[PDB]
Amino acid sequence: GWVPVTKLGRLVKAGKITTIEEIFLHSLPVKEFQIIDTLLPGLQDEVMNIKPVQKQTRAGQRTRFKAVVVVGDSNGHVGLGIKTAKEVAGAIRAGIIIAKLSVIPIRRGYWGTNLGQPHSLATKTTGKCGSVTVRLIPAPRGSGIVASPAVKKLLQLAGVEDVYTQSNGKTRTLENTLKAAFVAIGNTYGFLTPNLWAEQPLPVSPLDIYSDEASAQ
């Protein structure tokens, strides 16, 4: 079983937070992967890459493993994680823990018109990491996901349907590529489009409506 150690965890296990949308709205920093687990039940992982890495520790040569792992709803949530461990399944385990932790929303919207569900992206976005840039552009519906394998998996596992990409730099380093792409989808919720201009009233944190609850013993 699992014992929360964070005043966000006890809030969750006591079913005081329904969705992640309440985590994300108030930017409450996750540190207990079980949070993501309960709030996102239908999260399907995927090991993107596994790599033998040669460690040299105090004249003692060892062989470890670096694993690049992606996770996501096929709705609006992604996660990416890199981890190095001493054993392959261990690496993958830890990797999924990390990507669980850094889960992000996504603003997916329309191309031009406005029928059915939002299929593509809302605006053009761009992430950069390392030397790599990855750019994502709204497609029209049924244009599929136009990207190389890796970035394509990352976007599929994030419930994108139709999206043109343009990369640049040494895209052969898949960790920088994935990282950058990750950034670019992780910027969508960050581009003030006119339909978000209307002033809201500031919501009151879960941390204060349920403050007596989930307080340390």
Partner 1 sequence: SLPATFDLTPEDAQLLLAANTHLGARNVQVHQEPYVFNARPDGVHVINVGKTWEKLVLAARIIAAIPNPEDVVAISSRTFGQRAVLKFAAHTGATPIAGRFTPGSFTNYITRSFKEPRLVIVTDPRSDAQAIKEASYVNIPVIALTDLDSPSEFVDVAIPCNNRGKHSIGLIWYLLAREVLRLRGALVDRTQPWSIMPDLYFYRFP
Partner 2 sequence: TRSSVLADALNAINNAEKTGKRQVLIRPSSKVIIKFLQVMQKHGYIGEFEYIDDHRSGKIVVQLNGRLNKCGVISPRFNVKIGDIEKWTANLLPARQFGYVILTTSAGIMDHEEARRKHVSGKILGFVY
Partner 3 sequence: MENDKGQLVELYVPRKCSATNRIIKADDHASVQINVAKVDEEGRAIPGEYVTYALSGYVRSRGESDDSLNRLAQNDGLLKNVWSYSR
Footprint on this chain of partner 3 (rule: CB under 8 A): 21, 23-27, 29, 76, 102, 104-107, 109-110, 114-118, 122, 186, 189-192, 195-196, 199-200, 202-205, 208
Instruction: Please pick, from the candidates 19, 44, 168, 215, the single residue that binds partner 1 as defined by CB under 8 A.
Output: 215
Among 53, 191, 209, 213, binds partner 2 (CB under 8 A): 191
The rounded distance, in Å, linking the Cα atoms of 110 and 96 is 31
Sole binder of RNA in the list 18, 19, 75, 131 (CB under 7 A): 131
94 three-state secondary structure: helix
Using CB under 7 A, pick the residue from 66, 124, 141, 153 that binds RNA.
Answer: 124
**Can you tell me the distance from the alpha carbon of 157 to that of 74, in angstroms, rounded to the nearest whole number?**
5
- Give the x/- contact pattern for partner 2 in 116-145, rule: CB under 8 A: ------xxx-------------x-------
Q: Cβ 211 to partner 1, closest distance in Å?
A: 4
The three-class DSSP label of residue 89 is helix
Residue 16: left if φ>0, alpha if ψ -120 to 50, beta else—which one? alpha
Which residues make Cβ contacts (< 8 Å) with residue 147, sequence separation at least 6? Answer: 155, 163, 165, 181
Tokens 């996102």 correspond to 40
Mask for 21-50, x = binds partner 1 (CB under 8 A): ------xxx-xx------------------
CA distance 206 to 213: 10
